[PDB]
Amino acid sequence: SPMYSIITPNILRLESEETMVLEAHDAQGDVPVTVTVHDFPGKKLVLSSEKTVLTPATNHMGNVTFTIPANREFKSEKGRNKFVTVQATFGTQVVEKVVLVSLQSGYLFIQTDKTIYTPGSTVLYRIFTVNHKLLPVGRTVMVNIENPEGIPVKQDSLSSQNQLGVLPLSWDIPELVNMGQWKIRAYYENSPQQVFSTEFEVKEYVLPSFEVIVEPTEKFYYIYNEKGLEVTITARFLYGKKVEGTAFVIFGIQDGEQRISLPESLKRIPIEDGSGEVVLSRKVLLDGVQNPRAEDLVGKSLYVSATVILHSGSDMVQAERSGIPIVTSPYQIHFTKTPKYFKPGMPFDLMVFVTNPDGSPAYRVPVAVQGEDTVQSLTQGDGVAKLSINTHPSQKPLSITVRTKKQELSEAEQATRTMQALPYSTVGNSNNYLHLSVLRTELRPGETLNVNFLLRMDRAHEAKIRYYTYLIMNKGRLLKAGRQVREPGQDLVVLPLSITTDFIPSFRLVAYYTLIGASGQREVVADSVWVDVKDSCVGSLVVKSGQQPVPGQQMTLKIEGDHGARVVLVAVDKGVFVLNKKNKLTQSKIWDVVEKADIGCTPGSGKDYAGVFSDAGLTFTSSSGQQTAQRAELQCPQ
Amino acid sequence: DIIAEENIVSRSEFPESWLWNVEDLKEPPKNGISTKLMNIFLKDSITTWEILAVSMSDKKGICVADPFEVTVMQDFFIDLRLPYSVVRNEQVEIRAVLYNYRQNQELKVRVELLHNPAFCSLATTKRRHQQTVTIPPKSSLSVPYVIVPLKTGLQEVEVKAAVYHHFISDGVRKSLKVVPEGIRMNKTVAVRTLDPERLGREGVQKEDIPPADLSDQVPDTESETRILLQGTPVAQMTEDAVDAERLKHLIVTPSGCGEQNMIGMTPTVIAVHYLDETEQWEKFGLEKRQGALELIKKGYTQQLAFRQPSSAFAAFVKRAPSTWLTAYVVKVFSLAVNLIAIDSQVLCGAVKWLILEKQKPDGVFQEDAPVIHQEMIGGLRNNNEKDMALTAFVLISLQEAKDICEEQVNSLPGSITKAGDFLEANYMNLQRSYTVAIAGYALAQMGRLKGPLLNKFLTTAKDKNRWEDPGKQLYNVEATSYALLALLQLKDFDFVPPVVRWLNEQRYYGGGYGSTQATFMVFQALAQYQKDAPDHQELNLDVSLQLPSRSSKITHRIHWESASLLRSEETKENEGFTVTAEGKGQGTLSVVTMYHAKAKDQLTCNKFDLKVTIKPAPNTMILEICTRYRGDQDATMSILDISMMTGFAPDTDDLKQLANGVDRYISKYELDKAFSDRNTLIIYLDKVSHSEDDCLAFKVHQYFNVELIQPGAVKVYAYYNLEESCTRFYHPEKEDGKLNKLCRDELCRCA
Amino acid sequence: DNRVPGDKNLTKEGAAALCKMKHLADKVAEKRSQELKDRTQNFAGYIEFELYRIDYWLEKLNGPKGRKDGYAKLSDSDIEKVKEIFDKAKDGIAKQLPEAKKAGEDAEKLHTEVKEAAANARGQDLDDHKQKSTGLYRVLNWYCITPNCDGIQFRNHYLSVNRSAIDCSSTGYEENYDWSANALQVALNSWENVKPKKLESHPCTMTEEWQTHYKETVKKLKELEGAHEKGRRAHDAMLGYANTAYAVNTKVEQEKPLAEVIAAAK
């Protein structure tokens, strides 16, 4: 008997081209399919309707695209969510699923020409309107300039349909304003629940003539290092030449929001040839906190405050290097990227992530598993190393411990971490499993990724699996879907997946198969793998000189990028960033926003086939009752 | 052999940000990339510009380019280190820093400060403040200038320089924000509360905001008054809804004869309706709705089997039609209209049959075939005023089906009006609480419930919370639900809370035998309460301001949907004005004023004390500096900046002696510098006592003679709070150290 | 509209009477007239509805399925007797239709008359010192300027620069719902009894100009109420025949014997 099923994201976004994939396992001949979306629980309005046909030429698999209009009925009446009953009619059979709907349908990025302003100056800022795919979108957005006390001083409403997603704006700071961290808040009129904001400081200042860089020698303090923390003060004029002067350096211990300053650490050093060196002796650090015990300092972060004064005395600059962790191990191991569920009796792949205490990925640091130190792996440029370990068919929690094994460190300095991986529950205790695996290189667009489909299951039914269905989720949407063929007696097959720029920043590949197993029940076995693609502009944009300049000179500036794109420029004196370098717009933040807005928040398979899809963000519904548990929270657990 | 002053163009454009421009790429692509060339003009600032480019494409989305850095540079230039702001009449010193970055060339530089009427300085319209200096290669020199601002607002300071034997020159014209001799301060003019219904009169409230005192306001100073019309939304208490899990047993498959089918289907219909209204499906499980709807559809199909030819209904086809059963079926289907696809023909035919065949001319409905299951009719099980109860029940059903079958049955309004008239003609004579409640709901459905009718309806309530009547408590619950529905119809929300509280406290979640009518009615009433009960105190304030400075009546409106918004107004004037508020709601009108108040105490030089003096040595002079820290402890580390007067330089030996001191440190850079050109000096102090005057002194003597000697300056401050410095001036002749000026009536004339 | 010398200061009873006048006039203007017109026209509605029901019953007796739809049990003699009774009932009901229609038509214009009269009597309650008020509102607002009125509570309106308008809510009159012609007439009589007399040619008092409209309202409202009575009377006549028509239909649908059917009508 045919098994009709539909797969769609478990969160739908208003006014967006959400994609849904339909399939007819074991179907014969063409089958017309009708997709309808109704309000829930009303079931009164047909927000959308689509139709298509599944044919053998397409392997009885096809996608349907629909966009639910942003009807005014969708409101946070009392904070409750809203739902829509996706309903698909496979000829006579009807398959329907209730899917959560999220109103927030895009992002707003706010760029201010400067990070700090003086009273009476004009705040020039832009708002970028982009849907969840980061493409330009025309919608009505309203922005509020917020006083530090929280009073909205200026309120505007604008529509971006006349521009290619950029909304220039301005505001003149009154001379009588109050100082502090002013805020700009903006949100689409259709989703007041989500407000995007950016902070710009208002302060009285004069641009400094040079920048001061405080660079610790090792970007951390090893609590047993008797040499003490060594810091190099580097000062140079903004126009490139080196500084000469005197610098005052004071160290302090920070624990959470609280700060302690070590008065004994205050040292005066001469800055010659633009650089100078200062040392925070361990004795001073210990005595500054009443010397309770060496270990008591672990976990607390030092900070260095440096003030540089030119020998002419005409200028002064203050710079701080906060967050210099005090650690006993030079490395930290994170399991944030590993799957927390394992397939018994099959290899388990750990994407152990080891980083320096400051959070920067570590490079070429060996890692190993306790009890199996014979096998070791080295981190890639992104700090992720892959470790494979066999597992027994035990159906019991698996405890795994990894240890950095760098040659130059003592055993006590090696970082370590532990985690538990729960067994993957198999329907009907049929011990049928699917396992995806990828060779974790520094993946970048333009490469070909060989995804391996490893199948373990009883020989009595091996011939019934003749294709694996797979889906690729990116930015919370089905980027692609397709089927990989398999032959009987072929336990492993490789899918030569080609990667375009669309896959940036990461894509969660989900795969599964289905069969009529023991007792004729309909078994569905699914697995997921999370793959990271190096972050970069999906397009490109390079600014370079088209030809040093003297003041007032004409300069030919060359801009090269995507054809037909709208380019918005801004020039800022570097002196501004000396005073305040926070809240700068950068491509990394854009990807950070996208990643934090992903609908699935697990790196791999779940407890069962339902968990696999739910964790990846996909719903799966079938004629034979196979379903994923309902999702009722926009922010996923914890 | 020097560039004339007039010929030196002056750099004046120093924007901190520029090139705020939008460019669209349109050139023919090459290899999928298009290039655009821009001819930008670099501003006059000598710094490293950072150019950040963001591009948006309809296909490639957003992209942020790696910032590009342009380093504007020049072999020789001057940088003016002007403070952000200065006081209207406080003598201040500014430093012009000359840079010579020529790898191996020493420069003789003529530097002068141009005269501005806005500033008092050594420069005058008759003679310019010239000065000849020498700058070693790859070095810097600072020439101090003493100026006294004289006019508020932005003022421009211009400095020009030229190099002997070279065609190299530079000149800078920056701007200072001269401010009055005061400190910004804010005062709360008034903080009122707007509440027309409670604090106003006749529905309106008038407030008058007195003009701010501002006795300390400095003359000719800008002032601003800010008005905030903050709304204060007030939440309204709302009783909790029935927990979803309690309803788990209501959903049941319908079955049995025409009567039993109603028994089975009605709890499912009412449970589904309640869940839809309260939106409890999330906890109940979103999937179960499909099964519930399928069961409802099955029940409807089964019920249609018993539809008699005349569109009526009965327990069996052969049995005569029952008026009550038909009315109940109409009620249930009307509830199911928005759940499943019911044939409007069946409902309208039943309504038409009821109106035409089962209503007396006077308007009374009559029942001739009592229902088989007497427990079904709930509170009608025992009746004395049966006519009135049955008429009210039928009228409720007809009113519910009105909007569906009004167009199809033209006679319906007449029947409804006749029934209402009959009810009014006898409402006063009712005895049972159940009958009173049901008839009250029937009347309220058409707005006839008023005056003595409403008085009797409310009076019958036991304990002002329930229409109890001794007997089976299910009948009491049914009557209370009817009364609650009537009250919700009347909008009397001040009486509902106790009734809903009593209903919830009864903790009744439906049941089986003899629980159909009670379950249906109680759940419908609770759903209606959740739908219609107000969760927020009404907030529709309409407010206005009458400002004499304003030519028109400014106004604003605040609704519950916009209460949180902090609507505000700004005024650049100090005056009394009147604020008028109307409508329901609440709001905290707040008015504050900002201004520059005359100084209360030493506005500057509070942390430190300076005692600079200069005396002839036993030309040469002995400069003596004494310092103290006004505080509880010694200063951690202080910078003692000294600016020598024109033509005087410190004695090398004395500096070496001081540098060789215990608590004082002087950079090797200064000691190595030649005797001449050491016009600026810095002495670093490890500590300065707070209980005593720490003093130092060293010889200073002329290396060059000039017509007029600009006063020297001394500045002291801790290494971390330069803004909290103290400064002093010294001069061999003008003992005070201040430039001559006549401040008639607090307006100072240079001299 | 304008003040004049009077006989005495306005006692609290006089203010209460004036407020009663104003309240009754306003209620008549808003609700009572509309209610009367609607209930009058409803009689003409009901009489026609009963004609329609009679026609429907006759069609059931004779028509496409007279011999199948329940009535089939009737024999020809029963058919004839039922026809006789139904025709008699039809004649009786028809005899009353023109009276009800005439009453409704009269009430139609009487409603406009009373509405206009009462609204004019009530007044608009405008700010007199800028725009003169009207009717009993004019009287209440402009009477007790400030020693001519002792024992009153005045409105606290911010528009009361130089006005002492009586606050009617403070008079404490009962909110009785009797709004008949006598209701206005009785209160009018009370005012006259307590109304201070106009001095021939001392305390001041307000002119009685408003009485022109108010007194008229009583006249018309009496007529409107009379029309309602006329229609109501017609409505009563129809029930005598209509109930007979309904009873016979009920018995036959129960398949009861003719003797009961004839007896039930009689």
Numbering used by the authors:
A (entry chain A): 23 to 569, 574 to 664
B (entry chain B): 754 to 1371, 1382 to 1514
C (entry chain C): 25 to 170, 179 to 233, 249 to 313
Provide text from the study.
To provide a full molecular model of ISG65 bound to C3b we used cryogenic electron microscopy. We prepared ISG65-C3b complex in the presence of fluorinated octyl maltoside, which improved particle distribution in grids while avoiding dissociation of the complex. To improve the resolution of the region containing the binding site, local refinement was performed using a mask covering ISG65 and the TED and CUB domains of C3b, resulting in a volume at 3.4 Å resolution. The first of these, interface 1, matches that previously identified through our crystallographic analysis, with no significant differences between the models in this region. While our previous structure did not have interpretable electron density for loops L2 and L3, perhaps due to their disorder, or due to proteolysis during crystallisation, most of L2 and parts of L3 were ordered and resolved in our cryogenic electron microscopy-derived volume. In particular, L2 directly contacts the CUB domain of C3b, with an electrostatic interaction centered around C3b residue Arg954. The presence of this additional contact between ISG65 and C3b, which is not present between ISG65 and the TED domain alone, explains the differences in affinity of ISG65 for C3, C3b, and C3d. When we fitted the same model into the volume derived from C3b alone, the correlation was 0.76, indicating that the ISG65-bound conformation of C3b is equivalent to the free conformation of C3b. Indeed, we find that the binding sites on C3b and C3d for complement receptors 2 and 3 overlap with that of ISG65.
To counter complement-mediated clearance, African trypanosomes have a cell surface receptor, ISG65, which binds to C3b and which decreases the rate of trypanosome clearance in an infection model. African trypanosomes replicate within infected mammals where they are exposed to the complement system. This system centres around complement C3, which is present in a soluble form in serum but becomes covalently deposited onto the surfaces of pathogens after proteolytic cleavage to C3b. The complement system involves a complex set of molecular cascades. These come together at the conversion of serum complement C3 into C3b and the deposition of C3b on a pathogen surface through the formation of a thioester bond between the TED domain of C3b and cell surface components. We reveal through cryogenic electron microscopy that ISG65 has two distinct binding sites for C3b, only one of which is available in C3 and C3d.
